[PDB]
């Protein structure tokens, strides 16, 4: 794995670097033309991966010219990771959005499309509009998909070389496409490449979330179509994504998706100092130590950001900082404008900011303050007002760097380390000096994830002693270990649930493959003919046990069932009693033959083409109704998973059997109902 | 007349202040600073504060010029003069409230009694304090800041400054804790002189009845007939359901280490009514003038805008169905965005934001939704919201918010540049001025309210985001017969008469009365809801009255070094009534109960005076002379304790006893009233006025508690042990 495929990638980066001179010499129009050239080579059978060096050099030069921005080498590496079935972990500040332009371009060349998957519609629109000038420079088109967009505009978006949209809207389009009655109605093309912008939410937290299209004595209403996010993304030929050195869930990615994760090295060395966790007997002693840390550091001019787990915890450290005479600001979620004013100068010398359940990624904190806010505040910004301001700011920035950068204090750990990782990640971005320290007490909720009141209370025998602490780095490890076992416990449970999910996934995958085979064809004849014989054979068998005497036959039952279910009223009793020659095999053939002549007759009235399309129609409609019905029954079967499979024998397993049985039965019903409808369809006969 | 007549006399004063501007310009920084001492000299000689307004305002306006580079506008002078009276200054968003407020703050600081600028939160307190501190120091005044957790000496410094900034909450809590002090030097506040409240909608109206509570563990240690019989403390003929036995009853409604109790309580409404002067500000966010006047006796003056307010507030429109409303909304947005006008759409819910947003996309219309989950996206959106043909959807958009700058802010574009130069900015700024002017000429910012709120204040807040500082602008509210709003006309039939004024497919008309009917309905809802609230304030006035009386008493104690004569007075009071019980005034010697008297005396006062044995050696002395001597003995046993302890110690012990007994009986009372108030949710009946009976029982227990305060003080001072 590893730096084993990373050192192979570094070799390609040195080829890209070595090519910059060639690219710098090309005209704007020659750069555009590289796209057609790459496509001409692919046409001739070139392997996409062979184009990475030249293609990435093109994209980097186009970005130089268009954006004023040149991918760094580690940006090239990330782009290479994202071409593979991988998660590329790239630290916050590393420029993920720019990095992503690379495998987007690369994977657009074969003419099959690219789906960049964003967390919300604002980002989809933004990233598409921002990148559109880059990709147009290189002779590519950019599409945007939004909820509510009419189907023709959706088709256009999906017909672009690169599409932007949310996870939700891609998934719903897929479902709606598998409710279409003609292939022209579809909006998406074949699912080629999904590049997922933040995989933690999109791929992990939402993995099992169902997308559902719902629809109609009451009427009441019900599921017509369903798929989970996981099973949606599993449909792509190529799948990849990005997240920050966050992750903690590499094993999940692989288990849920067969996505490998790759640590992309930072552009600059990471130098933030993550100091050992500190543990106190009580909250009160914990708070005093936090206050004492703040005090020492603000006196050196170092700014501090404190993350807490609640408003009540935020109030408490505030009030205690005030008692101690230390100025600060609390980020109050009620006051968004105050909050952005505070965050802007959070990197200012000796600044102290308290934040509550600090979200994830966050607004960049500029060391020394943002000078940019300073001019945005000017009534009439000159250019030389804006120089005294940078010069003053430089001194501040460099002084804060000197004092150790941003210090992060976690006043509690969260049960998930990924959240702790996000808080800490707000310091030390882009090579910046920084530090972090997390605080625990024995009356912290988290001192519970060691499932034992004796265990944890031994820490009290280390005594702690009010300001006379030591640091025991084994504690840091011990806590990270406890947090990894919680994640693991939780995932073993999720995994069992996904193994139930895999039954419905396989069923849907089967039914949808069948539906689409039907949708893609103009003429469903061979199938019709073919299931008619199955249906008639099955139907006759119910009344004529195969290879049985005539005395076992229920001909009145067979006569009625043909009338009732097939509109087919045959003098079978009179047939038998007239020719002693008959026999089962020839009877079976007469009936089949008559159903046919009667059907061919209806066709002669309406016309072949009308008939063919009615047949297709009927197949699709009957498939859909039995599938909605199956989805509901699968639901009930699954919630009933507390009384059918028990003593020794596995549930999962009995459920798999019942499921298989019910899906088999559904496919046999499907055949029956189609032929029943087609046999019964009333045509006014001349 | 009313507001017109105030504004006229105030405009005359503005003309005076403006005439003074050249004197003030010619003054040195130091001469300006000296103006404060010169106003103070005059006030000390009997000048009336309001006579100082013209000179004072001129001085602050000149100093703001030198210090901030900001010169108060004439409308800002007017609002400053409104704020000197018991009034709310309604000043539109974008009018510079925060600068206006320096004026009455300066002036109300001159008598040396303090100013409490009240802010909504601690960020604003600190920020305002720090931003004004150079202005007020330039004028020889000090500025303090009060925050939760600040130590008491620091608090005292803040309250001792000429002007203080802090939140409502912290002012109140400080008041409560000052009334738990056992010496006057422990107090952090001064006498409550002037409170200038920065946003009165939230602080004065929404939070009027919010109680501030100090709690401390600081407490100490047919059905009925069954319970009533057995045990005692009530034992003879009293009724467990009496107010009196309320706590006992609670123990049996209740029936093991501590619990905790209210030690002190005030509502915001009652805290701000303690000030000698109260004033505040809010945006054209009125509708609540009657409430301010009702609850606080604050009058409201609508201050005019610096530039003419030309926003066009267009007639409400009413559609049959929600779906018909939404289509009209989309076509409005369409015609407007095609002329280059930007639009802001305010909705009441997320789902309502998604429906409009989704139909905008079905219509081909680019927009942004303000998604409450992505606040960084949201502030990027608000930035370009005044850009040409921009469309933004906001959900329950709160009061006030950020100025949307027509054209975008050019200054923001430039704050992207790592390296601006002169002709760059210039490109940016001139490019902007073209967009800005094009947006003005397309009609400025249009506001669509897709539904009206039950509260009109809120709709006015929304509409108020357009037409700031004289920009062109417009607003249109949309309604449906389906709208939750067409409901609070409390008849279904008396709404339905626009089935039959029945709004046809393509076309349109307009009705002035519909707009006025809707407004008038929102106004009946408001007055209906304030009727209910006034009832609750009536309950609150019972507590306020009692707490005002007991804290007045507590403070008189706190403020006196020697309480002797209060003690001497109440001891006679107490001994007189205690003896009355057994000896009916002027009664025959045979009208007298001693097996009952002697006992109480020993039991309640450690006073054991073999009484009938006197009256056996002296058959002659008579009732006044014996009342005289019982008093005398109690006094005598007391002075000996005092010559053991020393007058100083004894005097201060008496005061501590009074204070501590008062606080104890007071806390008991607060808890018993709490119970009565919720006992009086269903202690009984759709019937005999529940309120009223609670007022009576509460005032009766209050009166009772005043008499126990005496008795228990004297009993404590009688029984105290010195060896």
Curated annotation (Swiss-Prot), chain A:
Sequence positions that bind ATP: 75, 93-97, 364
Protein keywords: ATP-binding, Cell inner membrane, Cell membrane, Cytoplasm, Membrane, Metal-binding, Nucleotide-binding, Protein transport, Translocase, Translocation, Transport, Zinc
Described purpose of this protein according to its UniProt entry: Required for protein export, interacts with the SecYEG preprotein conducting channel. SecA has a central role in coupling the hydrolysis of ATP to the transfer of proteins into and across the cell membrane, serving both as a receptor for the preprotein-SecB complex and as an ATP-driven molecular motor driving the stepwise translocation of polypeptide chains across the membrane.
Induction annotation: Repressed under conditions of excess protein secretion capacity and derepressed when protein secretion becomes limiting. This is regulated by SecM.
Deletion phenotype: Essential. Leads to loss of translocation of lipoproteins Lpp and BRP.
Cofactor(s) the record lists: Zn(2+)
Gene from which this protein is expressed: secA
Record has Electron transport as a keyword: no
EC number: 7.4.2.8
Protein name: Protein translocase subunit SecA
Presence of the UniProt keyword Transport in the record: yes
GO terms under cellular component: cell envelope Sec protein transport complex; cytoplasm; cytoplasmic side of plasma membrane; plasma membrane
NCBIfam families hit by this protein: PRK12904.1 (NF009538), secA (TIGR00963)
Alphabetized HAMAP family for the sequence: SecA
Membrane topology: Peripheral membrane protein
Localization terms from the record: Cell inner membrane; Cytoplasm
Regulation: The translocation ATPase activity is stimulated by SecY and a precursor protein such as proOmpA.
GO biological process, one term: chaperone-mediated protein folding
Family, per entry: Belongs to the SecA family.
Self-association state and partner proteins as the record states: Monomer and homodimer; probably dimeric in the cytoplasm. It is not yet clear whether the form that functions in protein insertion is monomeric or dimeric. Part of the essential protein translocation apparatus which comprises SecA, SecYEG and auxiliary proteins SecDF-YajC and YidC. Makes direct contact with SecY.
SMART domains: SecA_DEAD, SecA_PP_bind
Cofactor binding, per record: Binds 1 zinc ion per subunit. Zinc is required for binding of the SecB chaperone to the extreme C-terminus of SecA.
Record-linked InterPro entries: Helicase_ATP-bd, Helicase_C-like, P-loop_NTPase, SEC_C_motif, SecA, SecA_CS, SecA_DEAD, SecA_motor_DEAD
Catalytic activity: ATP + H2O + cellular proteinSide 1 = ADP + phosphate + cellular proteinSide 2
Listed GO MF terms: ATP binding; identical protein binding; preprotein binding; protein-exporting ATPase activity; ribonucleoprotein complex binding; ribosome binding; zinc ion binding
